[PDB]
Write a protein that binds this ligand. Sequence first.
Ligand code: HEM
Ligand code: HEM
Ligand SMILES: Cc1cc(N)nc(COc2cncc(CNCCc3cccc(F)c3)c2)c1
Ligand SMILES: Cc1cc(N)nc(COc2cncc(CNCCc3cccc(F)c3)c2)c1
Ligand SMILES: C[C@H](O)[C@H](O)[C@H]1CNc2nc(N)[nH]c(=O)c2N1
Ligand SMILES: C[C@H](O)[C@H](O)[C@H]1CNc2nc(N)[nH]c(=O)c2N1
Ligand SMILES: [Cl-]
Ligand SMILES: [Cl-]
Lengths: 362, 362
Amino acid sequence: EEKEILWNEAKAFIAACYQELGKAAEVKDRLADIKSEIDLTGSYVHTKEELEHGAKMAWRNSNRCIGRLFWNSLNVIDRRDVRTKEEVRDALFHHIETATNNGKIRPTITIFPPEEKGEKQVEIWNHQLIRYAGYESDGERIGDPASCSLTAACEELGWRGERTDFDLLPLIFRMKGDEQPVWYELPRSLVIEVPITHPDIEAFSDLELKWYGVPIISDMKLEVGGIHYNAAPFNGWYMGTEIGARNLADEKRYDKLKKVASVIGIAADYNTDLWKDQALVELNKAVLHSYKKQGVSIVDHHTAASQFKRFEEQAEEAGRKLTGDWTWLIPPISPAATHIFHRSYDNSIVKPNYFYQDKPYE
Amino acid sequence: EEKEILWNEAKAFIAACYQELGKAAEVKDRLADIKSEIDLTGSYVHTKEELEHGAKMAWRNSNRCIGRLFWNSLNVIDRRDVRTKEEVRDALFHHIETATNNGKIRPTITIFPPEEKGEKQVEIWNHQLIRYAGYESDGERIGDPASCSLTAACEELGWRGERTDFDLLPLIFRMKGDEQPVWYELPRSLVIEVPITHPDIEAFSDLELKWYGVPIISDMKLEVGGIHYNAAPFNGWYMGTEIGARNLADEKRYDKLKKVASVIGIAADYNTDLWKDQALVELNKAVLHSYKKQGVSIVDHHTAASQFKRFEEQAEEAGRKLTGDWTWLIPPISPAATHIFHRSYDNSIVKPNYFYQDKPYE
Ligand code: HEM
Ligand code: HEM
Ligand SMILES: Cc1cc(N)nc(COc2cncc(CNCCc3cccc(F)c3)c2)c1
Ligand SMILES: Cc1cc(N)nc(COc2cncc(CNCCc3cccc(F)c3)c2)c1
Ligand SMILES: C[C@H](O)[C@H](O)[C@H]1CNc2nc(N)[nH]c(=O)c2N1
Ligand SMILES: C[C@H](O)[C@H](O)[C@H]1CNc2nc(N)[nH]c(=O)c2N1
Ligand SMILES: [Cl-]
Ligand SMILES: [Cl-]
């Protein structure tokens, strides 16, 4: 059964991949090769062409992603050759450097060896490669609450955070054969951060807010033609609302709205004053302004929605079915000001794609 | 088949209705009565108790409604006794008066005779009892574009609008047996309107915006125990966002955001300035302020969401399954600031309920 699943997915992937690459005449022979290889070894190995396009198709099929217009320009780094934790660490460091690109962010994915018998070769513990630690003890909340369980895990393994609101978590991953993951502190020279200021309101800096430049998802599984790439971190640039409307605004995250209201000089007493709404807008203006002043790539939700419309149009012109998750595609502020809000999307799952997987901690 | 459907729905409704009313011992006899009545006549007649509670259950089951906390206090007016267009007109006039209640809006429903053989006794053409006309000719847009097709229909029948941006449409409905609907102009003394001003920005009045006090949906079908009440208009009070984020903001409605931006003194040139978002917030603050100053009932989306949370809690305590449409329940501004955004809802259809029906025009 396990191998029949692999063969079925491989058949579907290769046909589709080779179609798009105008290599349709080579499907027949390559399928035989794969079929023999699965019979002999219990698996098959992607060509670099197949792997690159698979990772691109996977982004294109990500229903919850508004930034899919640029699926075909994804920078794919092939690291199936790594065998040591030093090599994984350096590959991860390199990803941060080249994706950051001095602020001109390059959408990039680094692909590590895939699962064998469902056996992971490399197991990344980080949710993102760059993220802030979180602490909760004796009514004391510090940092990012979403990071509380990973933070406590790292601190088991001998790491200690400074207990600032923005402690950088170490890279943490486990190798096949090892019982414990290893952790490495991030070189600060690799991590761009942006202080949040407001274009009009000088007092905004009193909040001492900041965020990191590059969101690098490192805990999802990339599936291509029946092959499970459990370790394959990828990044784009931020949409402003992810930071200003969620990361810094959610009560279960940094919960900054009351403080924003105070520094922008409005009362936070009456629901009918819409003070949360006003604070959200100003905080979001601040995030966009700050990233642009520093020369770090970012997109606002209006521009992003316009780009996504072009993605929709391109899908139609290419004769591709479009899939999407309305609940994730709408931005968390002024969603009805985007075209997305006013139409519906088929939330079917097409492969290749990126998938959730169970956390090794918790 | 038609009558078996009626009997099945009746069985399910009466059992549930009489349970909630603590009249469970009377289910058996009432079902026989209904069963005989369907056999003899092809239908059955609700007691006033059944009708009132049915209309209440129907509101409680309305998945897309955030204001369901107050389902049990709905004011039900039984007008199954009407036979003449004069009686329907006066019933409609009365609904507007008593629901408006000098600004202290009473959630009310007026229930007209139900369909017989799927044959309507009364056929209401209005989408809401109080709404603005819309015109489109020679590139000229006036009023509410959502009303363009009904407006053109009324103007076929001898009505003529003043072609102001806020022409009140006449009541328009057709009686069984008549080929054409009749129309009656609304007495202005019955219709409360609210001029939109802003609490801080004096120039806001230059926009000369206004809206009507009471949203009275008059084109949906109320279904109770297999009986189709196609004509049964109902009202609540407005949630502010319905007016400020949709009716006045949508490009396909009044499309006022650029004008709002100008009068609040901000540029409408760059997506990254979030000018639409800022304009939306101020326009929505204006709507809430204006309704409150005039003494007309209204609720903000934060307070409404808090109320809906209590509805959720009450459903659980009563042992009732909760149903809802996430896509309609989230407010169109700052949705992630409400609890609704952060959970999921089962969108199953439970009866009694209100349903869409085909328009007699278009
Ligand atoms: C280039 C800039 C990009 C932008 C602005 C962007 C924007 C977004 C946003 C706003 C979300 C919503 C997630 C949330 O609300 O927390 C999202 C989800 C997602 N994006 Fe993108 N994205 C970009 C690039 C990429 C790339 C390069 C990939 C992968 C190759 C990707 C794959 C995804 C996936 C898988 C999700 C959903 C993750 C989940 O299920 O939780 N995106 N994107
Ligand atoms: C008391 C104040 C009420 C408030 C604040 C309220 C709020 C809302 C809101 C905001 C919507 C969303 C509709 C849209 O986005 O256009 C809605 C939908 C709805 N409400 Fe309510 N509502 C109230 C009372 C009622 C009453 C009395 C009924 C019926 C007895 C009702 C039945 C519905 C129905 C059926 C819908 C969905 C209509 C559709 O499918 O398009 N509501 N409500
Ligand atoms: C590559 C990329 C670029 C960009 N601008 N934004 C993204 C956002 O993608 C994610 C960011 N952060 C977390 C996730 C995954 N979250 C999984 C947990 C979860 C599940 C369901 C709902 C929820 F709110 C949270 C995806 C990814
Ligand atoms: C009773 C009541 C109170 C209150 N505050 N708000 C409401 C709102 O309910 C509606 C208001 N206006 C129109 C409708 C029905 N719209 C049907 C057309 C439609 C279908 C699907 C999507 C859409 F945007 C529009 C319901 C109803
Ligand atoms: C059909 C499409 O999802 C459309 O934009 C929906 C979204 N959710 C909504 N929510 C509300 N409250 N009102 C609406 O008219 C809609 N329209
Ligand atoms: C599961 C629940 O619907 C939750 O609030 C969803 C809604 N849509 C979302 N949309 C985005 N972009 N990000 C999220 O985390 C969520 N969470
Ligand atoms: Cl993030
Ligand atoms: Cl309305």
